[model samples]
Structure formats: structure tokens, C-alpha cells
Target: GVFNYETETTSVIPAARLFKAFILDGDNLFPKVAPQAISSVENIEGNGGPGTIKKISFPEGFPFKYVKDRVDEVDHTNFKYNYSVIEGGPIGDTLEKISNEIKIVATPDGGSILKISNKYHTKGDHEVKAEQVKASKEMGETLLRAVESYLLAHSDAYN
Candidate 1:
């Protein structure tokens, strides 16, 4: 069984800039902005491109201790990124896999909107908890806030 969830976050950051920092440099920038939540993110296989595997380790108190992500698609010209959750995180009992796709769009005000869609492949007939979905939804918004503020303050970081 599979389920899909989609949401978007609008920010005062440029689309290309946000794409670069969040998608291109995510392995480094994620932990840099939220060290309390993410302890580290490193490339475990390949070279941060398609088919690359990235491992993200969380700090104490985080719901997930670690998650492995495999890059499936990346399009710099179109501002798109797609990755599959290959191990850990929510892939134990109920879920078998989770694939995430992100799209960035530029606004007339020089800001950007990020759309994140997640596909959850469940094990057998198991269902995902409502709270789990809630957590996933908020994660996008919260991460964007932290990253956007960081990029805004630094100005030259993602430019």
C-alpha cells in the first residue's frame, strides 16, 4: 500500500538560492543550522549525485536516530530534487519506503515557494499514524524557516 502527502512553504529567499542551499548543500547545511536536531549528514555512497546515498544522523531526543537517503533525481535547470528513504527512520515496521520530491518556484518578489511531496510505501495493510503525518508536514516548514533565516542573515552563503 502507498500514500501520498504534499505541502509547500513560501519564503522570502530566491528560488535558485534556496535550491542550492537546501538541495545541493543539504548534506552540510542541514546540520549546520539545526545541530540540536541533526548531528551530521554525510555521503555514504556515490558523490552527492543521482544514485548517491546520504546518511543523516540525529542528535539525542530526536524521533529518528538515523536515516539513509538515496538520490533518485536532480535537475538544476528545473529546480527539482527527488530522493528515496532507503533505511532507518520510519522504515521499520509500518513503512517499507518513503520517497520525497521537492520543487522550487520563483515569485515576482524575488522570493520562492518550495513544494514537497512525499510518497509512503507501507508494509502490507499497515497505516501511518496521523501524528506521523503531522510531523512530516511541519518538518518542511520548520527546516525552511531555519535555512531561510540562515541564508538571509549570511547573504553571501548561498549566493
Candidate 2:
């Protein structure tokens, strides 16, 4: 089975700054911004760009273990980021893989809106529950909120 999801969020920070926090400096900033949910992000392959592989480990007692993601596309000038979860906990027992495409667009009012698209491929003919996909979207929203808070608190950081 296949599942698709999209999430949108507005941020006071510029698109470039938000994209930097989400893609360019994602590995360095994720853990710092959401230490309670994530432990660390280690780049085991490539140079943090396309073809790079990252291991996202969760803190102790988290429901899901760790997830390994491969950077498929990273465009700083256009504020677009694409990646796929090639392995680990996010795939779970029934999921074959998960692909995520994120785009941050500048709004007319100076802020930016982040759009995230997700594609989930399931194993065999297994059915995916709505709650499962809902939970995943919620998690993505949480991460965005965490990053937004971090940027808001440190005005000079991402700018």
C-alpha cells in the first residue's frame, strides 16, 4: 500500500533561515533544538549533501528506535529539501520505505510557510492505519515547532 501526507507551517523566520535549520544545518541543529526527542544525528556516508546518509537516534524510552535517512535532494537557493528513510525504526515492520519532500516558501508578509510531503510504501499488501500516518505527521509538526522555538529564542543564530 501507499500513503501520502502533507503538512504546512508558518514561521516568522525567513525561508532561507528555516531551510538552513531544516536541511543545510539539520544535523548540527536538530539535537540541540529537540534534545528530549532526538539524541544525535551522525553522518555515516557522503558529505552532508545529496547521497549523504544520516542516522537519527532517539533518546532512551522513545517508542521508535533510530531512523536512517538518505539525502536525495538539497537545494539551498530554492529552499527545497528531499530525503528518504532507507532504513531503521520509521520503516517499522510493514513499511518498505518513506520519502519526504520539504519546501519552504517565502510569504508576502515577510514570514515563510513550510510544506512537507510524505510518501510511505508498505510491505506486500499490508494495510496502513490512519492513526499510523497521523502520528507521523504529528511528529513532523513537533519537530518544526521545536526548530521554530529555537530560532525564535536565538534571533542571531539562524539569521
Candidate 3:
């Protein structure tokens, strides 16, 4: 068995638009909106399809210089995307690896539900700290909120 964590965030934006901007074109959006924190997300290997590796770089921080994530699956029909953090970030330090699967579903009112499930593989007997988990969770939510607000301000985006 593996250490599991799950969370979901509700957004007013439609599922299609949200997915297009947040997931499909996320690599470009982050640097455009806020380059100070996230320098850029670029492809290190392969195309955008499965088995692709994307490198997300931060501004040369000690703990978080950059992170490499490998694409496992991408389902446009069901709005599901699966990826694993295989390098950089928290890997090798308390964590062996991080696997994530996210799905965007539509609500009755046209809003979207962003559901994320994670598997945190620990390094031997070491367990992940609650504070680290909380911070990581919130940081993702904060980015989502920022993305939502950015879409709110620009109606023409991700159409």
C-alpha cells in the first residue's frame, strides 16, 4: 500500500475552459501570469503525449529549484490527466515519488469540480509530515485560485 491524499476544488469556470487553460495550456499560462515565482514549464523530453517529461523551474531556490514531472496519461473525453513527480522538488528527501491524477467534471450550473488524488511514496520508514502535506495542498489550491481569478478577469481566455 502507498500513502494517499485527495482533495477537490470547485470553480465557477466551466469544466472545458478550466481544463484547457489549467491543464492543457498550463505550461504557458504560469510564466505569462507570474514569472517571478515560476520561471517556466518546458518539455524536457518527448511530445505532449503520454511519456512526456515537463520541467517546471523556480527562481533558483535552495529547497525548490525545479521539478520534473512525467506524463502518464491524458484523457480528454473523461477530462482526466495523470502524472508523476519523478525528480526535483520533494523527491529523494522524505519522499520516494509523487503520483497524481486529476479530473475536471461539470456541475449542474456549468461550474467545474477539480478532483485530485495523490499517492505519496515515502522513503522507507520515513513518513510525510502533516505540515508539509498541508502546505503542499494549499499551495496548489492557491495556484488554482490565481488561475481562476485570471480567467475571471479575462473572458476571452481559453474559449
Candidate 4:
């Protein structure tokens, strides 16, 4: 079975800047922005573009050790980002792929709103529970909120 989910949040930061900072440089900036959830992120392959493979390592107390994600598309002009969770954790163990699509739209108020869509692909007749999907969506929302807080506190850095 397949499941789809989406999460949205607003930020004071501009779409272009946020896109560059969070979506483009996420692998490098994640540790600084949310050190508790992420210990480090490294690009294991590619030129930080499509086909790029990033390994996200969590802190010592985290449940999972690391997850590898591959960049599928990055549309700078439209502020769209796409990637897939290729490996790691219980989610990885259960699914064939977790495709993530992120879109940032600039508001007339000079800020931006981020929309994230997640599609879960299951293996064979295996079914993913509603609780699992909720947990994953919550995690994504938490990460976005963390990044929003970090950017707001350090507004001078992104600009």
C-alpha cells in the first residue's frame, strides 16, 4: 500500500534565501541549526545536486544511526526540492522509497510558507500503519519549526 502526507509552516525568512539555506545547504547547515537531532550531514556522492547522496547522522542518543538520501531534483527558479530516503531506520526497513517534495512560496507579506509532501511506497502486501505516518509527519514538522526558530534567532546569518 501507499500513503501520502504533507506538512506546512510559515517563516519570516524569504523564500529564495530559505531555499538556499535550508534546501540547498541543508546537509551542511542541519548540524548547526539542530544539533540535537542531527550530529552531522555529509555528501557521500555527486556535486550537491541531482544524484547527490547525503548521509544524515543523528546524535548519540537518537534511535537510528544514520540515513542516506539521494537528491532527485532541485528547481531553484520555482523553489522546489525533491529527494528520496534510500536507506536507514524502521521506515527505511519497511518501505521501498520515501519520496519527499518541498515547495516554498513567497508571501506578499515578505515572508515564506513551506509545503512538504511525503509519499510512502510499501513492499508487496505490507501495510503502513496510520500511527507510523503521523509520527513521520510530526518529525518533519518539528524539524521545520526548529529550522524556523534557528533562522529567526540568527536572521543576520542567512541574509
Candidate 5:
């Protein structure tokens, strides 16, 4: 059998500011605000610049926590990154789509528009994919709240 899974989320924040913190500034995350969320992230190969190869290990919540090796990366213009899990985590059997992409654009409101998309595949009944889509969306909202709260706490950084 074959199935397609996808999820997308968008949120508004201090574009120039948060974009620097979340994307440009790697140190801003990792072991700081998103510990359990992301264990470790590093761009080991390539120029370590635009087309750098990244390795990411998920702690929990993800269907698979494997250290996916990113084979490609494109900065800002497309802000695209792709990887495949070759190790552990859930759903290691069927081998669905573990690739994802992120796109960022400048908004007329002087803020940045962020879009995240990912592909997924699951086994068993079709209900599995639906449940994941629903849960993942709910979780996305939760993350938006977290980021919003964080930015609010550091208002000085925004202005």
C-alpha cells in the first residue's frame, strides 16, 4: 500500500529579530529553550555555510528520533533542507518520508513569514496518518505559543 502525509504551520513573530535567533543564530536554540525538543544540531560537512550538511537528533515526540543526515541545504532564498533517518526512532521499518522543508519570506508588515512542511508515511490503518496530522498541528500551535511567550519576555530584543 501507498500513502501520503504532510503538515504545514505558519506563525508571525519579530521577523528580523526572531529569524536571527531561530535560524541565523544556531546557538540561540539547542540546549537552551528547546532541549527536549532537539538534542543536538550541527552542520558538519559542506562549506558549513549555504549548502552545509546538518545532523539532527530528536529527543522525543517525533515519530523517529534518529540522527538524520541532511544531504543538502539552501539558505534564505528557499531555506530548504532534506534528510533521511538511517538509525533509530519509531517507524524505522516501513521507511516513510523523513524529509522536510522550511521557507521564509519578508512580509509587508516588516515581519517575516515562516512556512514549514514535512512528509510522512505510516503503517496500519489510515487513521494513523490522520491522528498524526491532528496531533502534529496541535503541537504546532503549542510551539507558536511558546515562541510568542519567549519573545514577549524579551521585548527588548524585538525593538
Candidate 6:
């Protein structure tokens, strides 16, 4: 599937640890560092592992935009996780199905490559059709920068 919004965040940390931080630890570190964008995430069932159901909330932007459910498509090995917001996560209109996938892989010189791709199918609301993608991408990148910054600050601890 083609992505409406996509980007990657690279890190000096090994792939495994970077992958862990991006998926598992993101809920913790992201909100702490970038409260203006992300406020909290709650895993209602199945932990952060495969087949988990979660509802992540933000204070202002795009909160309850879609009903996101996740599945560990590749798990720790291939380092990919796929998610779909099947309902109300977007603004103005509910998304029929929004696929958001994250892939983490080993970079040549001993680091990691974290790539995020998202494609949303909209439900006839021109406002959401026009604005949701931009909002999601902008918010996602904002949080991604925060994650990179957080990792950079703690680099010496794990480097």
C-alpha cells in the first residue's frame, strides 16, 4: 500500500534497542518529552505486545482522531509493527481504515533505521480529507523529533 505520509528516524543505538524504544518505550518517553503533542497512551488489553488494543490520547491535537488497534506484524525479528485506526481517530470524519506501520532495521555502520508509513481512507468529509493527513504527519514528526532528542540526550548511558 502506498503511504500518504512517511518518514524515518535514524539513531546511533543498535537496531534492537532502537526498535524497543520506538514501539514500547515511545509511550513513556514521547509524552514526557513532547507534552504539547502527546499526552498519554493506554493499552486496554494485551500489553504493548502483539494483538494489543490501545487508545492513545492527546491534549489538543488530533485526540480521538481514530480508534487505533495494533498488531505486531513482524515482532522483534523483522522489527515491524502495523496499526489501523478503524474508527474515530481523525477529525470531522471517521476513517474507515488507516494503516500505520513502523519498520526498524539495522543500518550499515551499527545503528538503526526507523521508518513510519501511514495511509488513511477517509469518509467523505472534505475537512478531514484535506487536513488530517497534514496534521498526522506534522504531529508524528514533531513527536519523532522529540524521540530523537531524548535518545540523543541519553546516548552516553547506552552508547
Question: Which one is best on lDDT?
Answer: 1
What would the per-residue lDDT of candidate 5 be over residues 61-80, giving only the tens digit for each residue?
Answer: 77646454444454545554
- Return whichever of 1 and 4 wins on TM-score: 1
Which candidate number has the best TM-score? 1
**Which 10 consecutive positions of candidate 6 have the poorest summed lDDT?**
86-95
Clashing pairs in 2: none
TM-score of each: 0.95, 0.92, 0.91, 0.89, 0.59, 0.74
Candidates' C-alpha lDDT: 0.88, 0.84, 0.85, 0.83, 0.54, 0.68
lDDT of model number 3? 0.85
Spell out the clash pairs found in candidate 3: none
lDDT of 1: 0.88
For model 2, the stretches where C-alpha displacement exceeds 4 angstroms are none
Which parts of model 3 have CA positions greater than 4 angstroms off?
60-62
Residue-wise C-alpha lDDT for candidate 2, range 1-159, written one tens digit per residue: 778888887778788888878668878887988887678999999997889999999889987779999999988788999999999885767898888998999988878988888889888878777777887777677777888888888888867
The TM-score of predicted model 1 comes to 0.95
TM-score of 2: 0.92
C-alpha-based local distance difference test score of model 6? 0.68
* 1-159: candidate 6 lDDT, tens digit per residue: 233777776766677766666666776776788877877766777866667777666776554533556654647678787776654455224446677888888988987877888776656553234465777777776876777778778865323
* lDDT (tens digit, per residue) of candidate 1 on 86-120: 89988988898999999999999999888889899
